[PDB]
Curated annotation (Swiss-Prot), chain C:
It comes from Bos taurus. Guanine nucleotide-binding proteins (G proteins) are involved as a modulator or transducer in various transmembrane signaling systems. The beta and gamma chains are required for the GTPase activity, for replacement of GDP by GTP, and for G protein-effector interaction. This is Guanine nucleotide-binding protein G(I)/G(S)/G(T) subunit beta-1. G proteins are composed of 3 units, alpha, beta and gamma. The heterodimer formed by GNB1 and GNG2 interacts with ARHGEF5. The heterodimer formed by GNB1 and GNG2 interacts with GRK2. Forms a complex with GNAO1 and GNG3. Interacts with ARHGEF18 and RASD2. Forms complexes with TAS2R14 and G-proteins; these complexes play a role in the perception of bitterness. Component of the TAS2R14-GNAI1 complex, consisting of TAS2R14, GNAI1, GNB1 and GNG2. Component of the TAS2R14-GNAT3 complex, consisting of TAS2R14, GNAT3, GNB1 and GNG2. Belongs to the WD repeat G protein beta family. The gene is GNB1.
Amino acid sequence: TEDRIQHALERCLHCLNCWSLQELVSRDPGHFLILLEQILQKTREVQEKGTYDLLAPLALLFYSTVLCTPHFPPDSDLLLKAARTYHRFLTWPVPYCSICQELLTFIDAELKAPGISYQRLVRAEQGLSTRSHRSSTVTVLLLNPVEVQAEFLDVADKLSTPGPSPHSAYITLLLHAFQATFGAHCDLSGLHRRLQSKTLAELEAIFTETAEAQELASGIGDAAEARQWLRTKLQAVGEKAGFPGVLDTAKPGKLRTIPIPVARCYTYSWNQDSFDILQEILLKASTLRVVVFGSDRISGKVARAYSNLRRLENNRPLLTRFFKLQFFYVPVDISHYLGMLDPWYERNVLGLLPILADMLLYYCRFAARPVLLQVYQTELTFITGEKTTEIFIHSLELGHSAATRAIKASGPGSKRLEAVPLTLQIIYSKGAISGRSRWSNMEKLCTSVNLSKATEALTLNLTEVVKRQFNQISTSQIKVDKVQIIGSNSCPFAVCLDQDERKILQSVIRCEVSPCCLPIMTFS
Amino acid sequence: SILLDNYCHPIALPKHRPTPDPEGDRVRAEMPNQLRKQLEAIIATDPLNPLTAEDKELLWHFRYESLKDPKAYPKLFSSVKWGQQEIVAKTYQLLAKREVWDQSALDVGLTMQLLDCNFSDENVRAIAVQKLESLEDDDVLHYLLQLVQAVKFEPYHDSALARFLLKRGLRNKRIGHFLFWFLRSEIAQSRHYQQRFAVILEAYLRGCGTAMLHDFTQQVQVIDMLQKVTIDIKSLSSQVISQLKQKLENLQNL
Amino acid sequence: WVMTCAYAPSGNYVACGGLDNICSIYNLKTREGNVRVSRELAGHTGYLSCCRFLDDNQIVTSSGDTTCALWDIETGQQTTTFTGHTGDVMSLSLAPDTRLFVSGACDASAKLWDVREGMCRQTFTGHESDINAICFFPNGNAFAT
Amino acid sequence: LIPIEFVLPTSTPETALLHVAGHGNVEQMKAQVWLRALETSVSADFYHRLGPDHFLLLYQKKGQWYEIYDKYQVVQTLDCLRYWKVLHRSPGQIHVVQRHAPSEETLAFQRQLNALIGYDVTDVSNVHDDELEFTRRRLVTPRMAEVAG
Amino acid sequence: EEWPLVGYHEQLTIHGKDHESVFTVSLWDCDRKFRVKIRGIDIPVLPLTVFVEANIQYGQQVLCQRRTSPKPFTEEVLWNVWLEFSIKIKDLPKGALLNLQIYCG
């Protein structure tokens, strides 16, 4: 077991291996302490050797493991040793010190209160709330049938099914709560049977009296005292409850891996690109997890709905008055861009009840690193004088390409329905790394203008017509961040944002460009 | 452009604590007259002596033998290795007992080697300036050109040599005058350090009396006018001489 | 700044030292046949001035701290310390009988030591300057300085 | 928690008695005094209008005035505290004074000096830190002692 | 004149403290190695082969040396590269100079 875990770990940080290892450890509770010790040793191999690369995966592995470890020996030094191991990273750059300070807070919680993290996480996931401490982390899935894949659809259907029950959830949580503290002096079967006979209301009164001490003991300086005074608290509770003798038994009651009861997953079909679906769903202290499948074209639509929702809710906070938004991207051009960048993303979640749905109920609970692309604020003007600043996030277009898009996206019209050049003024700032921007101004006879991705930079495909008749085309890409397009009222142009035809715009006389809660996430 | 990686907390280097260092305390008998004879032949070399790592070693171990031989100091600290952290702690405990330097002979042909390019420490230059504090006004005047030329190497802007020149210029007047003119020449020339010299000079000019300020003002005006006339003149016979006469007469009028 | 060396009588080990204040013991017959450092005999407060192997596991060393010391190579610890000198100890010499050794110092005097116990048995004078070298007469009843 | 009674910039003059968070450094005390002035003060509108840079922290040492220029200085480096403890001045007092703008005399004097030197001393267009200006604020006391002597 | 007049290693170390009562980190606790990020250069106009060399210096001394590789001689060049130094962040002396030398060939 020991060497297999160590070698599987060597494989873990070098695509489903993370899973193979979570399963292997989940078999017999012993494996958990072995893996934890091995991780710790390796993290000191880094505390002393270098290669910053390997701090994030190892911190994640420690967090994931200790998060579910059924029970730690009262005499075990594993948590204090871990604290001493991660208390030497403060002399590293940011964010390593941030990661490590957060993890040390988690270790503080562990010592001061066992099983506090798992109980909090699940009670958020299951929507069960104490009269005082309310928590809800509801994962809702957005899926377009024809874009998503069969297997994935099966996963969504299974997750929509309310697998766990409130009464079963309460039973499981009381089980883990008693087994993290008492451990081998508690006979699972025993309690579990002195439990199923009870009722939901009392199972609540109890799980509440339990979670409350799981907090009050966590928030005390004497983690060891707090600990024994929490074993004592739970004991004094379980005595009244009515299962005495089940706990504190001189027999070596065995330990087992209590699973993680899946969170409340709802599925809603996405025959839409706007996020008004989300408000409509809402019409039906907490957080909301939104998971979506990443198609290629969908990219543009997705990012444009991201921008639209952000600005709309900035105008009036409605979806951010009771829930905090968490949006997850799942691959099925941004996919390629992120695929080669983050090796952890390309190892765990790029490739992807069934294995897929465990690694998706896993990815979604840990990843908390928002990596965002530079939204580009652009204010347009029309002949009528309308001015608004709506964003594009992947590329922009202008000229005859957007008109062609509309020409074919008209359906009924596209069945009943040359690039005349555009004498436009271009004022672009060639950005400087040092901050010394360089202005250059022209007026050119160009047909189509296509902003494309390279603070960030924007490459811009220019289509110059030196002569009309099969217009001449000299395509040149030039890096620019702030670009101003001026077009006479008598030269309106077909502007498209994000390559989506739903936002092909005309009548524009002026287009200003300049690089600029709900995050989209990246694994590492 | 460059980035130095950040830190959620700031990195505050302390200053070395001098503590009882007894290697000197209880090595008090005299050393083999062979080792002394091979060491004191090295020490009595040129001040441009290349110290081979052999020499730096032999001297760095004998670090309480050459602490009572001032004629060796710019050969002792030329050996100390600054690349480490224990070396510097030991060398800042070495300078904690200096009763055979302060009360030594005030040889100011030596102290002008503890304030040279090769030395950038914050206490080597401090002991050098402590030696110089006891000079007298005329002595200060004789070398003042190099003392000015020896604030370039002060690694920071604020230092002890600069405060020395400041304190000297506010109790004499010939020193004040020559200091003023030398600092002004460098500020007008040494673009590299001109900001530093300007800081020094302005910190000086707020202390002297009003009359000295006025005398400086008038000298500056005269030099300026003469510079104008000179630059005009070297723009190109007896007509030039007459134009010289006219310009000089006008300046008298101006 | 190595100053002394001493081939072991066994031929397996060689020792040296100097300004480092340590008697570094080297192994010629190493597991891999390389020249690996068996021990760093530290504890002296002055340069290592001289040393002689008693055996593969024992070695006497003199230093600039005005004392001698017997070492056990295994423990790397000064078995005995020979105090009494008032000057830097330049040299020593083991008698054919390993129980006695003499040492020369800058005090212009030599001292006979008891290896077994660690005491000064006799003190000889007559030199007007530092004693630079000393060794036992072949028989072991006399010595020259 | 260190109790310091602050001389308020505005009023009989009003004084605020606090419990300074002396564990940290001057920044904590600045935040605490700002919030206390915001809440307690009857004239809290006055300070609400004014931002954070419109007041300075000066303390009377042996009669004269000293500036707390660096908030990064730790509580121990604040010699006022040790001075008070030796004098047993509990609570201490730090004068929260209101800033002011330069007068014309000073500007003319500075232009005169800059003409003498040949190069501005208040130029901040080629510096990537405040080494120069702190050199200038530090050279004052040595010059004052030199002149007095 | 109206201008009013303006620690050791035992008190300023992480060891012996809880992370939530930490505000400073002595330069000597940092056992790591010094490293710098040379994003690139950008000149308004160039007034061949080119390449950088960075050094640490302490009074005409060169404690450590580093460099990079030849590059095109444009008006602006980028690497975003890292250069790591041999000297630990605890071995730095108060007064080190980070010299930055654009050579050409």
